[PDB]
Structures are given as structure tokens and as C-alpha cells.
């Protein structure tokens, strides 16, 4: 049993979307399946469920007037669509197959990959990269600023500098743009002997950057 | 941004300032800095407005990062005032002034206290000095029509209608929060922990929330989630280019199905489509906490700097 | 309206040792209770349904009991891939928030104190009108750590961001980024900027400071 969903999203307040899911290795017309969604740090809400036999589909009360759920037999799948997207839409979202419970609700026996929708007035930036300079072992790393979307990459010495390597999870700043950090720990000997270069990508806007660190 | 009216322009310092009726007339006022300007009348012997030119959208926020007031329709703790969902009391002598604000200059500035909210006013011709303990004679204050520059509001604070929680579920959450919060003993001046060694009063960052009771519920590890309720609170109605229109006019809208509205409006009120126009104010909804296994719908909820006293 | 929590929010237990996920139901449910398993960015997995059956292709050692109003988890003996976030859901009803709020499993660890590193500004970064000091905390454990930045000895609040790592796969510590904010202008108004620590792990709250040099 697969439910396979579509890929990212990068989408503006105020517009419409469609994300779709596509199903297989079992026959869709007579299991209940749905879509639930998980707002970035939260736990899990759903939103609603769709029985494809009949069409009877049924949205958590939240979520009534928001979206529409529908689905086409013929294709074994579902959709789910909102005609104006807000900011706090920006989640991760799954469909799912579930299973009744009589006069009850459900559970969730199946679970599609995720689709992670992200919608925000900003336009692609990349990356401003700065260094964190030093100043037995010493710590040294790269401060990566002000970007949109996720993800960037940060890796060191092109790849060479692997042990002892914390890249944290970015933040959303009040201006729209993420910033993150990675650093390194390194023993004090090789400081002015040894070159440390951070080397920051961001595929979105097609930009690479590669900054010394310096004592 | 503004709700309903844009920024005001006084030129009587000693006009009238009238009671209004409607919820949009009174929306109106607290979009002017007029409930502040009422406050500084009654209490602190003060000529004049403030909000001149600015109203509440150029209020000064301590921290500067503040979210909420990026949502034009979220109230802070004097539009609630207002409103009568709670009261600024006038500082007495040991309500404690927190530091970190830039005070100097502020004629007025708002700070939530554990067990309730407090106000600090300047009379006129004066304002504040810097550290924030006194009110010295002002120069830029002589108008008596100040700018919002001179009013601040201490905190990342919403305000809203409460559901209301019964005492032992109060009791419940009172007892949690202490959980979280061992080594501190009192708040702002009341007992949070019975303590031995109990410290001098320094700065606390907190997030908590007023859940109608004797004293906030100050929180840790919390959970929040917004709902638009679209009630009859979520609307203001109003005469474009003549500002709100009259508790009437209002009335008659939410009642009648008759006038003018947006998507919104016609799809829980009633449109036809001059007359007045009632539409939703910009904000993410009511918010509903989560905190110690319960799910509560507070009065207000933020996060602000208060005094507390640490175990010796 | 029916609410389920599950307790403790972070079950910090060992790996191969066993490990018992708490869900407690505010009315009874019978055994209309389900579990699921949510892999670090991953899909959920369903474990257990009826409060006991276990789904299909999940190995022995997830066990489901209960029934009314106490449901467990347990994990005979913790592996690798155990270490993830824990839900319980209920259908009794179809209310609009029938899952319980999750639980996090974490290596278990004996307590390691941060290494703390603060970080003034770049140059080139404040030729551009903001300046961005960066607090790290290195390798440490528990994760509940406190962190308070003091410019001339004023308190901060509003300015800063937190970020910690996911746990080390070779030591389970975590390490966290505190980055605090300010304009060139306010920046260059102060002289002391302070970073102070607190952990399990330190006899005393640690500061690391610099001067604006
Ligand atoms: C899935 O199951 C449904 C119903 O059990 C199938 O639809 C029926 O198909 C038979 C013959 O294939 C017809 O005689 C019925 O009239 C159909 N009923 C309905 C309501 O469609 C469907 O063919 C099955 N599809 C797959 C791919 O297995
Ligand atoms: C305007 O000022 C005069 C004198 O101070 C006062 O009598 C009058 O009441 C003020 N305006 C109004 C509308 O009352
Ligand atoms: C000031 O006093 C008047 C008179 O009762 C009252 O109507 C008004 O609400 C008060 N305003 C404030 C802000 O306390």
C-alpha cells in the first residue's frame, strides 16, 4: 500500500493550491482516506476525510470553508486544495488512509511522505555568509544570514572537515528571511597553520559562497 | 496599521472627551490613543492627548520585537480597558517599575504585573526620566497634544474575550506553573513559593496568561492555537470617508442583513448590495493555550517583563 | 472536547532498556485508543491500534495495553530507530483534536556540562547596518539549558534566537546557538556584551563576555 505525494511548495498569501496524492496497491473506492496537517514545531491536526465510493467527504470543523478535498477514482487519488493561502499555512502535509470505527471516528493505517508547503511574501535571497572568528581546543564558525527559502547546505574545507561540526536548524526572523550557524570546534595548535573555509549553498537562488575563517 | 480611523489631529487640549456607545465608535477611540489620553485625565492630572498624529499604531512596544501589534485587531491591555474586560490600575508606591524600557520622555507607559495590570502617568508639562522613577518638568510636553512617542506599553500582550475556568481547574494550573518555576519566590511583590533565602527583585521574562483569576499563570513549556471565531466582535462597521457609524447604525447591520459588507460579512450576517459597511478586523483569531494538560481559552496571553525573587 | 494527555512531554530513557509511554484519556474511551510513531522527518507509522492489536509489519517489541482511561506504550528493549516522537489518538468520538500532544524519547546520558564561545561581530557584516552576536553552547547534556544575554549589564529580552542540535549520534549531547540582534547604531552605543550560562552541569552560571575593542 503507497501513497505518494507531490513535492515543495513555495507559494504567496493570498494564492491558490492544489497538492495532490496518488495512490496504489490497493483498490481506492472503498477506504476512507484524508489529509493532515503538521504546523512547523506543532503536533498533528487533521482536516479532513473523503470516501471515494460515494464521495461523502467531511472536514474537521476548523478547517470548514478553508479547503476543498476531493477525489478521482479513475486515478486513485486525492487532492487537496485551499483557493487563498495564508502565512500561517506554512506546515507540513500528509495524506493517509484510514480505517473506520462503526459509529466512531478513525485511525490512520497508512501514511503518505509529507508535502511541505511554505507561503511567504518574500522572494528567493540568498544567503549573506559572515564569519565567526575565534578570538587547548578552539571554536570557529560561519554565520549564514538572511536567506529564502530553505534549505542551505554548509559544509567545511570542501567537504574535508567533518568531525566535531554543529550546522543548527535556521530561524524565521521577524522579516521573513531564515539565518543559521554552523560552527566548528578545532584544537588551538592548527590555528595559523591551518585554513578553515565554510562553504554555503542555497539552491534556490543558485548561489554559492565560500568564506575564510580567520583568527 | 490602523482598525478603523486614522491618526488624529487635536487642536483643543482641554476638548471633551465623549463616553461613545457603539462597539465601532469605542474602536475607533482606542484606534485614536483616546482611552489613553482618558486615562491620563482621570488619574494623573494631565492636559490634553496623546497619540497625536500617531494613535495606537505608533505606540512604543518594550521589547521593540513585538508580533502582536503587527495585527492591527489584537487588543493590548488598555484597549481592553476600554472595553471593560479588565482595569489598568494607577501605580501605587510599591508597584514595582521594571527596567529595560526606554522611559525618558513617556508620558504614560502600561506594564501586565502578576495579579493584574498597572499604569504609571505624568501630569502636565512633565514627563518621565530615564531610569523611569520620576516625572521632571518637560519642555516638548507644553502643547499638551503629544505624540504616540510618549506612550508605551510594556510587553507582547493580546487581550480577548475569556472563556471562563472554574477554580479547581484554576488551582490545577496555579500549582503547575510553580512546578516549572521552583526557584522563585515572589512575583512582583506576591508569593509564587514559600522560600527560606529569597533574594533581591530583578528582571523576569515570562510568558503567562490571565485566566480571569487572582493572579496570572506564568508558563514554560506551553502550546498555543488560534481560531477565527468570524462573531459578532470580529467586525467593525463603518461610513467610508465619515469613520465609524453610530451604535444604531451598527446594530441595525449585525440584525438587520441589509447593508454592506465584505466576503466575510454576507456569509454569516447577511449582505445586500449608501449605507454602512461592517468588515473583519485584521487578526489571527482568538487565542486557546494549552498548558500543564489543559486546554484553556485565557483573557489575555503574552509574554512581558515583571519582578520576581529568586531562592537563597 | 474529550482531551488526552500523555506524560512525561520527553521520556529520556536508555537504549536497549525499556522504555513506557504514558496516555491518559479525561473520559473513558474503552480501547478505541491508537498509537503512532513519527521518525525524525519522516511519515508517521501506525504501531498500534485497539489499544493493543499491533498493525501490520510492526516488530514484537511495541506492546499496546490499556483500556478506559490509562493506555501504555511500551518498548521492550529500546534500539536506535526507537528514539522518535510518540502519539496517541482516540476514536471514541470524531472530535476536531482526538491525538494526545506526543511524546519525545531521547538517549538517556550521564549529565555533561556546555562549552560556551561567544562571538563579537564580523567587520564586514557591520559595515552593513546590523550587528549579529552569536552564543554558542558546545556538547552538552541535559538538554534544558538557560541562557540570558547582558549588554553593559542590562538584561536582554525581545533581541535573541535559539537554536539547539538534534542529539549526537556518537556522544547524545546537544549543543545550542543563541544569536542576539542590534543595529550598528544601538550596537555601538554599549561596551560590554555578555553571554551567561546556566546547566545542571555547572557548579555556577558560566559568562563569556567581550569589549568592543
Ligand atoms: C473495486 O471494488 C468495487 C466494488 O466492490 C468494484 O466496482 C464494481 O465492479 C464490478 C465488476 O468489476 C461491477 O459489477 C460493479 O457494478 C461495480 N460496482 C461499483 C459500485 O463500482 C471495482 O471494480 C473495484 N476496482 C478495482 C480496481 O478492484
Ligand atoms: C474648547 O476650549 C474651550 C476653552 O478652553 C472650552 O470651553 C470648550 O469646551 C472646548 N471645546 C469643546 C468642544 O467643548
Ligand atoms: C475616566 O472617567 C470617566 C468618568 O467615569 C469614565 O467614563 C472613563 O471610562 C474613564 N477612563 C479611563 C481610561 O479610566
Known amino acids: 500500500v503507497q501513497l505518494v505525494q507531490s513535492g515543495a511548495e513555495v507559494k504567496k498569501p493570498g494564492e491558490s493550491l492544489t497538492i495532490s496524492c496518488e495512490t496504489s496497491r490497493y483498490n481506492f473506492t472503498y477506504h476512507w482516506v484524508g489529509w493532515v496537517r503538521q504546523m512547523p514545531g506543532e503536533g498533528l491536526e487533521w482536516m479532513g476525510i473523503?470516501?471515494?465510493?460515494?464521495?461523502?467527504?467531511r472536514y474537521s470543523p476548523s478547517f470548514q470553508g478553508q479547503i476543498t478535498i476531493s477525489a478521482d477514482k479513475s486515478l486513485s487519488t486525492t487532492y487537496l486544495h485551499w483557493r487563498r493561502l495564508k502565512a500561517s499555512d506554512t506546515a507540513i502535509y500528509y495524506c493517509?488512509?484510514?480505517?473506520?470505527?462503526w459509529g466512531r471516528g478513525y485511525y490512520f493505517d497508512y501514511w503518505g511522505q509529507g508535502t511541505l508547503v511554505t507561503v511567504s511574501s518574500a522572494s528567493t535571497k540568498g544567503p549573506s555568509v559572515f564569519p565567526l572568528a575565534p578570538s587547548g581546543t578552539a571554536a570557529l564558525g560561519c554565520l549564514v544570514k538572511d536567506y529564502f527559502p530553505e534549505p542551505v547546505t554548509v559544509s567545511w574545507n570542501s567537504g574535508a572537515l567533518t568531525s566535531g561540526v554543529h550546522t543548527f536548524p535556521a530561524v524565521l526572523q521577524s522579516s521573513g528571511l531564515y539565518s543559521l550557524s554552523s560552527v566548528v570546534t578545532v584544537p588551538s595548535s592548527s590555528l595559523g597553520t591551518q585554513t578553515y573555509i565554510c562553504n554555503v549553498n542555497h539552491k534556490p537562488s543558485n548561489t554559492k559562497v565560500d568564506k575564510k575563517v580567520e583568527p | 496599521g490602523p482598525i478603523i480611523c486614522a491618526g488624529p489631529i487635536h487642536s483643543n487640549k482641554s476638548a471633551d472627551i465623549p463616553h461613545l456607545l457603539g462597539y465601532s465608535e469605542k474602536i475607533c477611540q482606542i484606534d485614536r490613543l483616546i482611552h489613553v489620553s482618558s486615562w491620563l485625565r482621570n488619574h494623573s492630572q494631565f492636559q490634553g492627548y496623546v497619540g497625536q498624529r500617531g494613535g495606537r499604531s505608533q505606540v512604543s512596544y518594550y521589547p521593540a520585537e513585538n508580533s502582536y501589534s503587527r495585527w492591527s485587531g489584537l487588543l493590548s491591555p488598555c484597549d481592553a480597558d476600554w472595553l471593560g474586560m479588565l482595569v489598568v490600575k494607577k501605580a501605587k508606591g510599591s508597584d514595582m517599575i521594571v527596567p529595560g524600557p526606554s522611559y525618558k520622555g513617556k508620558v504614560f507607559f502600561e506594564r501586565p504585573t502578576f495579579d493584574g495590570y498597572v499604569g504609571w502617568g505624568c501630569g502636565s508639562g512633565k514627563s518621565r526620566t530615564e531610569s523611569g522613577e520620576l516625572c521632571s518638568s518637560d519642555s516638548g510636553t507644553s502643547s499638551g497634544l503629544l505624540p504616540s512617542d510618549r506612550v508605551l506599553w510594556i510587553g507582547d500582550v493580546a487581550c480577548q474575550p475569556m472563556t471562563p475556568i472554574p477554580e479547581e481547574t484554576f488551582l490545577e494550573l496555579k500549582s503547575f506553573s510553580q512546578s516549572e518555576f521552583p526557584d522563585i519566590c515572589k512575583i512582583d511583590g506576591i508569593v509564587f513559593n514559600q522560600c527560606e533565602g529569597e533574594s533581591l527583585p530583578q528582571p523576569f521574562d515570562v510568558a503567562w496568561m490571565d485566566v480571569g483569576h487572582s493572579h496570572k499563570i506564568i508558563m514554560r513549556e506551553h502550546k498555543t492555537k488560534w481560531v477565527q471565531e468570524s462573531s459578532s466582535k470580529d467586525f467593525v462597521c463603518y461610513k467610508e470617508g465619515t469613520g465609524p457609524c453610530s451604535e444604531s447604525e451598527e446594530k441595525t447591520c449585525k440584525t438587520s442583513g441589509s447593508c454592506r459588507g465584505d466576503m466575510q460579512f454576507c456569509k454569516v450576517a447577511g449582505c445586500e448590495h449608501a449605507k454602512c459597511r461592517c468588515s473583519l478586523v485584521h487578526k489571527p483569531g482568538e487565542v486557546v493555550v494549552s498548558y500543564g494538560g489543559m486546554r484553556v481559552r485565557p483573557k489575555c496571553y503574552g509574554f512581558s517583563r515583571m519582578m520576581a525573587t529568586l531562592e537563597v | 472536547e474529550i482531551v488526552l494527555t500523555q506524560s512525561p512531554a520527553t521520556l529520556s530513557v536508555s537504549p536497549g532498556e525499556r522504555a513506557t509511554l504514558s496516555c491518559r484519556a479525561s473520559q473513558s474511551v474503552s480501547s478505541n485508543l491508537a498509537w503512532y510513531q513519527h521518525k525524525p522527518g519522516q511519515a508517521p507509522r501506525l504501531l498500534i491500534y485497539?489499544?493493543?492489536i499491533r498493525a501490520t509489519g510492526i516488530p514484537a517489541r511495541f506492546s499496546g495495553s490499556g483500556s478506559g482511561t490509562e493506555f501504555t506504550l511500551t518498548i521492550s528493549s529500546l534500539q536506535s530507530e526507537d528514539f522518535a516522537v510518540y502519539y496517541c489518538?482516540?476514536?471514541?468520538?470524531?472530535?476536531?483534536?482526538?491525538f494526545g500532544q506526543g511524546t519525545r524519547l531521547e538517549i538517556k546520558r550521564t549529565v555533561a556540562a556546555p562549552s560556551v564561545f561567544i562571538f563579537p561581530p564580523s567587520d564586514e557584516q557591520l559595515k552593513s547596518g546590523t550587528a549579529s552576536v552569536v552564543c554558542l553552547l558546545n556538547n552538552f547534556y541535559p538538554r534544558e539549558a538557560k541562557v540570558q544575554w547582558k549588554v553593559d549589564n542590562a538584561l536582554q529580552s525581545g533581541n535573541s534566537q535559539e537554536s539547539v542540535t538534534e542529539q549526537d549520534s556518537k556522544d547524545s549531547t546537544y549543543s545550542l546557538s543563541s544569536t542576539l540582534t542590534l543595529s550598528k547604531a544601538d550596537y555601538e552605543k554599549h561596551k560590554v556584551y555578555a553571554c551567561e550560562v546556566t546547566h545542571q552541569g555547572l557548579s555556577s552560571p558560566v559568562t563569556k563576555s567581550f569589549n568592543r575593542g
Open positions: 485497539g489499544a493493543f
Open positions: 493517509a488512509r484510514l480505517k473506520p470505527a
Open positions: 473523503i470516501y471515494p465510493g460515494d464521495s461523502d467527504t
Open positions: 489518538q482516540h476514536y471514541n468520538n470524531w472530535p476536531p483534536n482526538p
